[PDB]
Design an enzyme around this catalytic site. Structure first.
Site: not given
Lengths: 377, 374, 374, 65
Positions: B68, B70, B162, B201, B285
Site C-alpha cells: 500500500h 502511493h 483498487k 479503501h 500507506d
C-alpha cells in the site's frame, strides 16, 4: 548433503566456441539461466550439483534471434481458409531460434495486437524469449492502447512498430502518417527502454525504398531505427537496399525467399558492397505466407550455405542471426555468449547441424528433437 | 585465473535465520539474485568468487513486502499544495522494504496510472520489486487500457484493482458497478497470471463492510480476492473486519494509523480472535496522509517487545502472509529458488543490512544504493 | 457421351436409415449437396452419372450438429500458455460433426469475434456448416458491430449471443444488462432470420438459474430463446435445469463433463423426468478446458448400450433437437430438400463414412478432406 | 417430538417448512413432510429437503405420478 540444485548449475565443456566471435576450445558455465563464466578448461567440481555435459568435438554458438515471425498466424490473402495456425514452440527451438520478435501482416481484421501479446507471453513462460511489434501493414496503426507511442512505451513486450509500403496490400499511407508513425515508435521506445524501431514490409512497387527516404526528409528519426524487410524480393529493391545500408541503415533479408536474390547471396552481396555485417540481419518470416505455411529451416540453411559455398567464417555467418539482431534491437543479454548474458546457446556439429538447444538454461532440444514443447502440441 | 564474478556469489553465514519460520543458525548461499542454498554451515569455498559475509550474532529474515504505497505521490485532499511527493528508493530500502505494491488514492485527476506504472518500472530497474494496482478511490475506475479486466490482464505490472467504499471521498459506487469491477479484476488476473484482487479503501461510514458483503451476493468472486484496508481506522469497522477474516477473507491493517486500534494492537486482536496470521497483512500507506515507512519495522519490534508475539510470527503479516495473498511467487520466504530479498537485523530487530534481488541496498542502516535523483 | 458429373449424383443404398426416426432399409439419392430422394429401393440408374455406394448392413443417420465449440481456440484461464489452439476440420468431421456453432469463452481479450467469424467462414468453405454466437462470458458483450442486436441482425453467421452467469468468471452482470442483452439477440434474430438465442454458460453458484428466472420477469423474451449449458456440472443446478425444461425451456448438456452427472446420465434423467427429447440437446464445448469431440459419439453409443435408449431417440439430442432449437433449416433430419449431411455407421455405431453437403469427409473413419494447414 | 406435515398440491410445496426453519430453531430432523410423491415438483423438492438433512415420508397408498 546440502542441496544446491536451485542454482541449476550446468557445465558445457569441450566445444569449439563461437560467441559468435571465434574463440577456441572454450567452456561455458551456466547458473540460473545465465552465463556466469566463459574460459578454457573450467574445473568440473568448481560448483556443487553441476550438470556437466561433454560437448567434446562439438560446436557451441549463440541461439538464433528471429525478428520476423507470425506467432499467432498470418495469411488470409486468399480467403479465411488461408488463415495460418499459431507457431509451435518446438518448431522454433528445433530451428535454433531462442529469441523471437512477432508481428502481424496483411490481415489486421481477424488478427489482433492483444492476441500477439498473449502468445508472445506464452512462449516466454514456455522457455524462450519473445517480443512483438505493434501495428500491421495498415497505417495508421491499429494498436493496443490507442497510440503507437503509448504501446511502444507502456506495453513491455512491444519494442516497436510494423507497417507496409510499396506493396499492393498496403494501406496507401502518405509520408505524413508514415513519419508520425515512426516518430511515435521512436519516442515511445525512449520512454520504455525499447529499440523503438519501425519495420517496413517491402513490396514490389517500383518506388522501392522511396517512402523511407521521404520520411527521413520529413522528420528526424535516426536512419538506424528504420528497417526495411524482404529486401531481396526483387533486384532493384535489393540494390537500393545496399545503398540504404551504406547511408547507415541496417537491412533485413528474409531466408524464406530464394529468388531473385537468395538469402546467402544477399548477405554475401552486402559484404561485397562494403556493408558491415552489423547492419545486416536475416529473418524467417515464419508461419506466414498448395498454399503452404512458411517454416524456419531456411535460417540455418543460410548459415550453412554461407560457410559452405561462400567463404564466410562460421563466426561471420552467425552474426546476421545473432550479434547483429541483438544489436539492432538492443536485446540485452542476447546474441552474445559472454559472462552475464543469457544461456541461449545451440550445440551443433562441425557440419553445422543442430544437436542441442539451450534457452535460459533449460534444454529445449535434446537430440535434434524437442524435449520441451508448447502446452498443446 | 577465470572470471566467475558474473554470478555475483554471496554467502550470508552464521546468522539466526527466520524465513520467517524460526530455523536455527542457518547459512544462505545467493547466486544471480537467487537463493540457491539453505542448510546450516555451508562452505565459504563451495562456489568460486564468493563474497563471504560474517553475520554471526545477527538475525536474517525476508525483506518486507509493503502492498500500500502511493509511489508517485498522493494527498491533495486540501488543495494542490497538499499533493505529496513521489517515493524515494532509499526511503523504502531503509525501512526494510524489498517488494512494494503502488497505488493511487483520492486524487485521480492530477495522478494517473501511466505515471504510477512508470514509477513502478523505474523502481524495478533500480533494484527492488514493484507492482501496482490500477484505478483509485473512483468507481468506475480510470484505467490505462479502457477496462480493469484489460489492465490487470495485459499491463505487466498490474496485479489487481483498487477503489474506495464506505468513505466520504468515494464516488458513491453502487453494488453493480462494484461487483463488475471486482469480477474484471478477477478474470483479468487469470488471463495475466495475476492475483486479480480488489483492494477496498475503508472509510468511517457506519455501513463499513456492508458493500463487500453486498458484493458477495451479486457475483461469485472468491472472498479470497476482496481485501479491505485501514480496518483499524475505527473500532466498529475493525470488529467487522475480524468477522470477515473469520470467514476466509484477508484483512489489511495500516501501520500508519495508531488509534483507535494501533497496528500491533490490530495484529494482536486478530490472533486472540483466532485468525490464522495467514489472513492478516500489514501495509504502510506510505507517502499518503506525509506518511512514512518507519511504522512497519516498528510494528514488528513492538509486537515482539510490548506484546508476546515471536519474531517469526511477527514477521508473517509483513512477508509470507502478504506474499501468499498476491501470489508473489518467490518472495516473503527464504528457500532455494526464491529471490534473495534479505534483511540483516540485530538481536533487537534494528535493520543493519538490506539485500534486494542479491544486490546490497543498505550497508550501515543507511541505503548505499539510491534512486537516480536523490 | 454428355457430362452430368456437375450434379455430383450419389446414391446411398441398402442401409438401415435413422433420420433420426427409425425408418427401415431406405435409400437416399443425393444431388448438388442436397437430399433429393428418400424412398426404399431406388434405381442405381435413375439419374445419369451416379456414384452408387453399397451401404448394405450399415447404419445411415444425420451428421451431428455441435452447438458449443471454441472454433478459434479458448482456455487461457491460467496464463497465456493455457490458450488452446484452433479447431481442426478433420477433428470435427471424424467425430461425426457436420454442422457446428462456434463461440468464445472466458478469454475475450486475446480472442475476438472477428477471428471467430473468420474461422467460421473458413470452415464453411472447407466443406461443413458453421455459425457463431457473438459475445463471451462478458456482459455487456464485446461485439463486432457495436450492439448485440446489430450483430445478430446483420452479421450473416451470428445466430445469437452468448454470456456467463452464476459463475466465478463472469462480469457480475445485473438483471437489466442481462435482459437487454437477450432482448437484442431476440430482436436481431427476427431482423436477420436467425433464432436469436441467448446461451448462458452455467457456473457452480448456488444461485444457479435464478438469473434466468429473474430475466423472465423483467422482459418478454420467449423462454424458448434462453438456453443454459453445462447444466450437468453440479446436481443442484441440473435438478433446476430439468424444472426449467419442464416449463418449455430447452437445456444443453455438455458431453465434456462426466460428473456429477454424466452426459448419458443427463439425457437419461431428463426422459425419466418426463421431458420431451425435443427440449434436450448435447454439446461438446470442444477445444475448451483441451477438450475433444469424441464424447459426442460416445454419449450416443453409451445411451443405446449402457442405458436403454433406442438408436433413433439417442441421436435426437445431437440432431433434430439441436436443429429445431436454432431453426437450422435443412439439417438434423434426412428428408428431400434437407442437406446431405450424413454419417455411415456400423451396427455398433462406429462412424465409417461422413458426408457434408454431399462431399465425402471421412472415408475409412479417417477424414480424407482436411483444413488447409493440417 | 416430531412435526408431521400433510403435503397438499399447492405450488408453494415445501415453502411453509423452509419459512419455519427461518423463523425458529427446530432441527430439520424433526420435520417430516408426507405424501411427498403426490405430485412431481413436490417430490422433486422433497429430494432437495432430504439432501439438507431432513427425512422424507413416502406413502405407499398413492401410485401416481
Amino acid at each position: 548433503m546440502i542441496d544446491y540444485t536451485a542454482a541449476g548449475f550446468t557445465l558445457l565443456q569441450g566445444a569449439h566456441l563461437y560467441a559468435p566471435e571465434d574463440r577456441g576450445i572454450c567452456d561455458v558455465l551456466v547458473a540460473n539461466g545465465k552465463i556466469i563464466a566463459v574460459a578454457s578448461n573450467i574445473p568440473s567440481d568448481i560448483v556443487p550439483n553441476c550438470t556437466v555435459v561433454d560437448l567434446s568435438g562439438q560446436i557451441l554458438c549463440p541461439g538464433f534471434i528471429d525478428q520476423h515471425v507470425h506467432l499467432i498466424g498470418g495469411g488470409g490473402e486468399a480467403g479465411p481458409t488461408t488463415r495460418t495456425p499459431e507457431v509451435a514452440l518446438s518448431r522454433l527451438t528445433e530451428a535454433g531460434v531462442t529469441s523471437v520478435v512477432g508481428l502481424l501482416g496483411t490481415d489486421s481484421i481477424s488478427r489482433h495486437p492483444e492476441s500477439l501479446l498473449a502468445k508472445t507471453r506464452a512462449l516466454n513462460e514456455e522457455g524462450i524469449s519473445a517480443w512483438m511489434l505493434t501495428g500491421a501493414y495498415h497505417v495508421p496503426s491499429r494498436t493496443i492502447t490507442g497510440s503507437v507511442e503509448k504501446d511502444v512505451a507502456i506495453i513491455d513486450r512491444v519494442i516497436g512498430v510494423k507497417c507496409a509500403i510499396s506493396d499492393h496490400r498496403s494501406a496507401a499511407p502518405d509520408v505524413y502518417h508514415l513519419a508520425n508513425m515512426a516518430a511515435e515508435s521512436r519516442v515511445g521506445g525512449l520512454l520504455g527502454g525499447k529499440p523503438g524501431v519501425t519495420v517496413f514490409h517491402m513490396g514490389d512497387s517500383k518506388k522501392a525504398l522511396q517512402p523511407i527516404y521521404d520520411l527521413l526528409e520529413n522528420c528526424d528519426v535516426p536512419i538506424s531505427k528504420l528497417l526495411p524487410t524482404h529486401v531481396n524480393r526483387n533486384v532493384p529493391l535489393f540494390e537500393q537496399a545496399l545503398e540504404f545500408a551504406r547511408k547507415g541503415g541496417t537491412i533485413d533479408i528474409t531466408s524464406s525467399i530464394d529468388e531473385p536474390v537468395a538469402p546467402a547471396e544477399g548477405i554475401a552481396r552486402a559484404v561485397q558492397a562494403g556493408i558491415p555485417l552489423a547492419r545486416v540481419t536475416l529473418s524467417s518470416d515464419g508461419n506466414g505466407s498448395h498454399i503452404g505455411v512458411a517454416g524456419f529451416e531456411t535460417l540455418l540453411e543460410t548459415v550453412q550455405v554461407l560457410v559452405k559455398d561462400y567463404d564466410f567464417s562460421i563466426s561471420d555467418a552467425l552474426r546476421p542471426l545473432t550479434s547483429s539482431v541483438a544489436g539492432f534491437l538492443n536485446l540485452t543479454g542476447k546474441g552474445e555468449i559472454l559472462p552475464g548474458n543469457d544461456a541461449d546457446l545451440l550445440v551443433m556439429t562441425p557440419e553445422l547441424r543442430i544437436e542441442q538447444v539451450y534457452a535460459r538454461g533449460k534444454l529445449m532440444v535434446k537430440d535434434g528433437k524437442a524435449c520441451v514443447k508448447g502446452t498443446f502440441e
